[PDB]
Scaffold this active site. Structure first.
Site, PDB file in Angstrom:
ATOM      1  N   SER A  65       0.388   6.715  -0.523  1.00 11.84           N
ATOM      2  CA  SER A  65      -0.663   7.723  -0.354  1.00 11.84           C
ATOM      3  C   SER A  65      -2.001   6.995  -0.413  1.00 11.84           C
ATOM      4  O   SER A  65      -2.555   6.789  -1.492  1.00 11.84           O
ATOM      5  CB  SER A  65      -0.610   8.820  -1.398  1.00 11.84           C
ATOM      6  OG  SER A  65      -1.692   9.712  -1.239  1.00 11.84           O
ATOM      7  N   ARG A  66      -2.521   6.637   0.753  1.00 13.14           N
ATOM      8  CA  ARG A  66      -3.752   5.865   0.756  1.00 13.14           C
ATOM      9  C   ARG A  66      -4.978   6.753   0.733  1.00 13.14           C
ATOM     10  O   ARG A  66      -6.045   6.315   0.292  1.00 13.14           O
ATOM     11  CB  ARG A  66      -3.816   4.938   1.971  1.00 13.14           C
ATOM     12  CG  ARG A  66      -2.599   4.056   2.167  1.00 13.14           C
ATOM     13  CD  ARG A  66      -2.137   3.348   0.901  1.00 13.14           C
ATOM     14  NE  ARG A  66      -1.239   2.241   1.222  1.00 13.14           N
ATOM     15  CZ  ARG A  66      -0.510   1.578   0.330  1.00 13.14           C
ATOM     16  NH1 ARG A  66      -0.558   1.907  -0.953  1.00 13.14           N
ATOM     17  NH2 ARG A  66       0.273   0.586   0.726  1.00 13.14           N
TER      18      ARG A  66
END
Ligand SMILES: Nc1ncnc2c1ncn2[C@@H]1O[C@H](COP(=O)(O)OP(=O)(O)OP(=O)(O)O)[C@@H](O)[C@H]1O
Ligand SMILES: Nc1ncnc2c1ncn2[C@@H]1O[C@H](COP(=O)(O)OP(=O)(O)O)[C@@H](O)[C@H]1O
Ligand SMILES: [Mg+2]
Ligand SMILES: [Mg+2]
Lengths: 523, 542
Positions: free
Chosen positions: A389-390
């Site tokens: 989850s950037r």
């Protein structure tokens, strides 16, 4: 059989009328003899020509809009899907056995809409907004369209706020931003629902202590599931008090495939009330891979040409136009947000399937849940290497962002020194340190169901894990040690970590102090 | 009033048939629908045969009634081109979606045209240095070339195309066009807000000093808007190439969504479907789009296109058709990305027309072919490595495996746009540096260094300094006992002293949902319209 050679047949060219006034005086008694055999003619209403497979072809309906909610005289509602030159194709939101040829179709005058508002909070509705919990109709509500377009580029902003999910593996490794979309993908029976349920229960726990504008109102869309599972889930939410903040849209396995198809759109329409009014929403589309199957059934019963795996080809657009509505709005639109958690079930871990890779191309990250980690008791079975989850990164808890970086590096080293050891025959005693620190951190990360953990008690536990303070317990008692860390450490330091947000030097001083005076049960 | 105004005959999703009583419009002409809630533009696709045209809608068709007035405009979809479109965002039909007022159009160009002729083809090959090691070594880009980034849903072609923007678009002196075709609107907002704070887009009165124009047809749009927004991006780039005469960069994020949107609208146009599920006209549609993104005698378009592959299948006909149109294909792999090697470029599937010894020099060509031969021999060995282990290899085979793992890690590189989510700062690597580094690993000069010293480093100096950093620690593991900053008086107020500086929050427990809410009084019966259109309760029979 030309057209200009047929328009020339509009003008009269007979000049001999021995049959016009022969039948013009004999037509009306003939029509009056066969009068009770006529159905009354229909122009602005509709009449069912043919019904079958959950698609009614409707004669008439001269002024229906495309995508408009029509009503059959049985009471069951439809949707004017394709308007044609002679009929209207209607998909039936319900069982098509109560529809007969000759039934009057009544136009409701509005594109397909569901009731949205504050009074839909607490309620278990079906896929079309009609409530199924038995406690009445939806009061304090207003109808709004289910197929509204997502906000554009200029109506958005970057995610900043951190939306804690209460799961230690997720909120430590895969942190979720406030307007993010995060995919929960995994096999069958691998804890995909449980992560979303822990997020919902944690939002109930956090709503009691935030100043009324950081509250997150959840929506659970249960597509294709069993009705007993939805009943047990609503029982669980009322037992924990979470139902005060959540809506439960449910189109179950017995419901018609237009209802299972439309239930995520009605759920997202209900959650977009909270997005469009400055509040914050969270929506879980549980098994969007069942919504894709219901839509494939709808497409193949409309005889639309199938594509990959059998899917219509706008099955990407089906999920893309749904998930694009989970935005973080700008400051001049209220600052509201909507977080989406689509769930996709894979078959035998194949994430290179069609619908899986479709939704991976839509969402901002994935939460992979491996069945091998699940069968070994590591629950939540987060594939730490594959889950990403950037967008939620650099939008998470700063105290957790301090500790989770070395947590991520130590877990990366642990995965590679476990891949280094396919075998127990050669010990290194320098990789054995990280091979025991990693089995420490894996046992640290796993937590049990329906008890989400606040973010400061996650931060303190991972602080006590990646540093020292836990090397004496072998691998076994680290759950009991983490519970002793949470219970025996002075509860003021949680308040300082919560209100300051990060770990100050005056705070990790008392962290190193208070962690040495706890008594760990594995000695 | 009557002629050149047809009426909506039938609506089938994104496909609208319009019936004209006389003077049918030409194919590709745009038609405006009057009486809609938003601006609905229909582009004519077919002449059905009974004075009926068949159209594709640029917006959603919900609300279209089968009598609605449709006004012909006598011309295709025409979009504002010029320098005045720089620093703006346009949608498919050219409306500004940045809330910055109207677009100062130098001209209004039709989005449909022909490809430049064979007489106008520019045939000159010059290298485009990107600062990416695997690209500049094994599949080098052309300065007026067409570049395809083939990817499989999560392998990193948007990160790679954003790094190509960051690395190439400023060293390149001309203008730049980003066309977003069927991608995330979050990514378009991120690109806009980071092109503003880079000064590439300058808002307000400094708009003329912007270097980039954005066209966006993202994945919330209907299939008619995603099937034509690539053509709006090409029109904006083609005006700069032809009329302004200068060099353009055209970044198209997911040119696959063009093909997929045409196959969505193509089933409703009444066509027999082709292979896997596609339109029969896939190759000519993609060819007519891609033959316009070329350099000519007057200008130059360096074209970088992300190409999604559907289920990690490169034999799917949209990637397999896109492969013919590209001078340099950069094929990104999923199994490479699962080894942590980023950018996940498959070094034995990414080709270029510039890997030619008469173009890039014999030393560069020889080190690229040597790297590829080492990696191919490793790939040939991996099946017996997986079963029998490495203990059954020959010693030159163990040298092959060691050097191939070394150059596998050495093609990995940190990016200056991945530094926000990895922490590692990103390294631009010059072409001579990566040539000399891979030549040195091929000759054997770095066989002493370990595997993981090559991982995510810029140069061949930085593998040596990472071995210096990794080696020094190999002893530094503990002895941090006390003399800390974690005392109890030197920096330190007490714990109960620390609670006393915690500020109070106001908790209302009202949920604030009924503040500005107008509640519709729902009925006890389904309110329907009768034959006269009056809102009547539902009658009681079946
Ligand atoms: N963190 C956890 N710790 C222990 N057990 C868990 C945890 N999460 C889930 N489980 C157990 O795993 C089982 C499956 O959980 P869950 O229903 O969340 O998975 P699922 O992916 O929804 O499966 P399906 O989609 O087939 O219903 C449940 O019976 C639950 O008791
Ligand atoms: N060069 C890179 N360095 C580090 N991580 C990367 C890189 N490229 C991709 N990733 C990872 O892969 C994910 C997908 O990247 P993206 O470019 O959005 O993929 P795609 O566009 O192919 O779906 C990112 O979120 C990131 O975590
Ligand atoms: Mg489930
Ligand atoms: Mg992408």
């Amino acid at each position: 059989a030309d057209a200009k050679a047929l328009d020339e047949l509009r003008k009269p060219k007979f000049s001999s009328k021995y049959l016009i006034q022969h039948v013009s005086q004999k037509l009306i008694p003939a029509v009056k003899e066969w009068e009770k055999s006529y159905q009354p003619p229909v122009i602005h209403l509709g009449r069912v020509l043919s019904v079958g497979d959950g698609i009614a072809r409707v004669y008439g309906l001269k002024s229906v809009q495309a995508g408009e909610l029509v009503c059959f005289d049985s009471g069951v509602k439809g949707m004017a899907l394709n308007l044609q030159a002679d009929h209207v194709g209607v998909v039936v939101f319900g069982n098509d056995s109560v529809i007969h040829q000759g039934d009057l179709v009544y136009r409701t005058g509005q594109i397909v809409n569901v009731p949205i508002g504050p009074g839909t909070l607490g309620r278990v509705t079906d896929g079309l907004g009609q409530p199924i919990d038995g406690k009445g109709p939806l009061t304090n509500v207003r109808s709004s369209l289910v197929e509204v377009k997502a906000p554009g580029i200029i109506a958005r902003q970057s995610v900043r706020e951190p939306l804690f999910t209460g799961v230690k593996a997720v909120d430590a490794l895969v942190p979720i931003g406030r307007g993010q979309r995060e995919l929960i993908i995994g096999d069958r029976q691998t804890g995909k629902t449980a992560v979303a349920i822990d997020a919902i229960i944690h939002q109930k726990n956090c709503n009691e202590q935030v100043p009324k504008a950081q509250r997150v109102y959840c929506v659970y869309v249960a597509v294709g599931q069993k009705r007993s599972t939805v009943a047990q889930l609503v029982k669980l939410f009322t037992q924990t008090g979470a139902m005060r903040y959540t809506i439960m849209v449910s189109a179950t396995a017995s419901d018609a495939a237009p209802l299972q198809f439309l239930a995520p759109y009605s759920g997202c329409a209900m959650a977009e009330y909270f997005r469009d009014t400055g509040k914050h929403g969270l929506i879980i589309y549980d098994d969007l891979s069942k919504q894709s199957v219901a839509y494939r059934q709808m497409s193949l019963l409309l005889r639309r040409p199938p594509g990959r795996e059998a899917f219509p080809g706008d099955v990407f657009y089906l999920h893309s136009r749904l998930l694009e509505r989970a935005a973080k709005l700008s400051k001049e639109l209220g600052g509201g947000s909507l977080t989406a958690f689509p769930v996709i079930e894979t078959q035998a871990g194949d994430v290179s399937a069609y619908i899986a890779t479709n939704v991976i191309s839509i969402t901002d990250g994935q939460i992979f849940l491996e069945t091998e980690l699940f069968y070994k008791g590591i629950r939540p079975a987060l594939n730490v290497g594959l889950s990403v989850s950037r967008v939620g990164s650099a939008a998470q808890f700063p105290g957790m962002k301090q500790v989770a970086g070395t947590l991520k590096l130590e877990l990366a080293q642990y995965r590679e020194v476990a891949a280094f050891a396919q075998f127990g025959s050669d010990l290194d005693a320098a990789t054995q340190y990280v091979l025991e620190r990693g089995a420490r951190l894996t046992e640290m990360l796993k937590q049990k169901q329906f008890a989400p953990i606040p973010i400061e008690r996650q931060t303190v536990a991972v602080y006590a894990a990646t540093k020292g303070f836990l090397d004496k317990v072998r691998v076994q008692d680290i759950v009991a040690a983490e519970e002793a860390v949470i219970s025996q450490v002075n509860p003021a330091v949680f308040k300082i970590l919560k209100a300051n947000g990060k770990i100050t030097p005056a705070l990790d001083a008392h962290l190193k102090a208070e962690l040495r005076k706890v008594k760990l049960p594995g000695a | 009033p009557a002629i050149d105004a047809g009426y909506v005959s039938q609506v089938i999703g994104p496909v609208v048939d319009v019936r004209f009583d006389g003077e049918l419009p030409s194919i590709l002409s745009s038609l405006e629908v009057e009486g809609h809630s938003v601006r609905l533009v229909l582009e004519v696709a077919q002449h059905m045969g009974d004075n009926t045209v068949r159209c594709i809608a640029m917006d959603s068709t919900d609300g279209l009634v089968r009598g609605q007035k449709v006004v012909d405009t006598g011309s295709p979809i025409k979009v504002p081109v010029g320098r005045g479109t720089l620093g703006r965002i346009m949608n498919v039909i050219g409306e500004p979606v940045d809330e910055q007022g109207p677009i100062d159009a130098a001209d209004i160009w039709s989005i449909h045209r022909e490809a430049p002729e064979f007489t106008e083809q520019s045939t000159e090959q010059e290298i485009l240095v990107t600062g990416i090691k695997v690209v500049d070594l094994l599949a080098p880009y052309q300065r007026g070339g067409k570049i395809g980034l083939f990817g499989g849903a999560g392998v990193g072609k948007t990160v790679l195309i954003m790094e190509l923007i960051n690395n190439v678009a400023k060293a390149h002196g001309g203008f730049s066009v980003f066309a977003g075709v069927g991608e995330r609107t979050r990514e378009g907002n991120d690109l806009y807000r980071e092109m503003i704070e880079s000064g590439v887009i300058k808002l307000g009165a400094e708009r003329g000093n912007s270097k980039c124009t954005l066209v966006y047809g993202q994945m919330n749009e209907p299939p008619g808007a995603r099937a034509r927004v690539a053509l709006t991006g090409l029109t904006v780039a083609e005006y700069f190439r032809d009329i302004e005469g200068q060099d353009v960069l055209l970044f198209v994020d997911n040119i696959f969504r063009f093909t997929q949107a045409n196959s969505e609208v193509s089933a409703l146009l009444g066509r027999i479907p082709s292979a896997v599920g596609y339109q029969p006209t896939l190759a000519t549609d993609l060819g007519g789009l891609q033959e316009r993104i070329t350099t000519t005698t007057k200008g130059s378009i360096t074209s970088v296109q992300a190409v999604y592959v559907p289920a990690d299948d490169l034999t799917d006909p949209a990637p397999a058709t896109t492969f013919a149109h590209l001078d340099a294909t950069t094929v990104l792999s999923r199994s490479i990305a699962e080894l942590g090697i980023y950018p996940a470029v498959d070094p034995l599937d990414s080709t270029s027309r510039m890997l030619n010894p008469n173009v890039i020099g014999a030393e560069h060509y020889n080190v690229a072919r040597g790297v590829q031969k080492v990696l191919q021999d490793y790939k040939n060995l991996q099946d017996i490595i997986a079963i029998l282990g490495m203990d059954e290899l020959s010693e030159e085979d163990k040298l092959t495996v060691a050097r191939a793992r070394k150059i596998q890690r050495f093609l990995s590189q940190p990016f200056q746009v991945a530094e926000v989510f990895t922490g590692t700062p990103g390294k631009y690597v010059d072409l001579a540096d990566t040539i000399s580094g891979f030549q040195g690993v091929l000759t054997g000069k770095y066989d002493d260094l370990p595997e993981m010293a090559f991982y995510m480093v810029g140069d061949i100096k930085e593998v040596k300094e990472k071995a210096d950093k990794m080696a020094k620690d190999i002893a530094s593991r503990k002895e941090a006992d006390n003399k800390k900053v974690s005392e109890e008086l030197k920096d330190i107020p007490s714990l109960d002293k620390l609670v006393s500086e915690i500020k109070e929050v106001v908790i209302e427990e009202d949920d604030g949902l009924e503040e500005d809410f107008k509640a519709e009084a729902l009925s006890s019966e389904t309110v329907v319209l009768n034959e006269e259109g009056k809102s009547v309760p539902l009658p009681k029979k079946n």
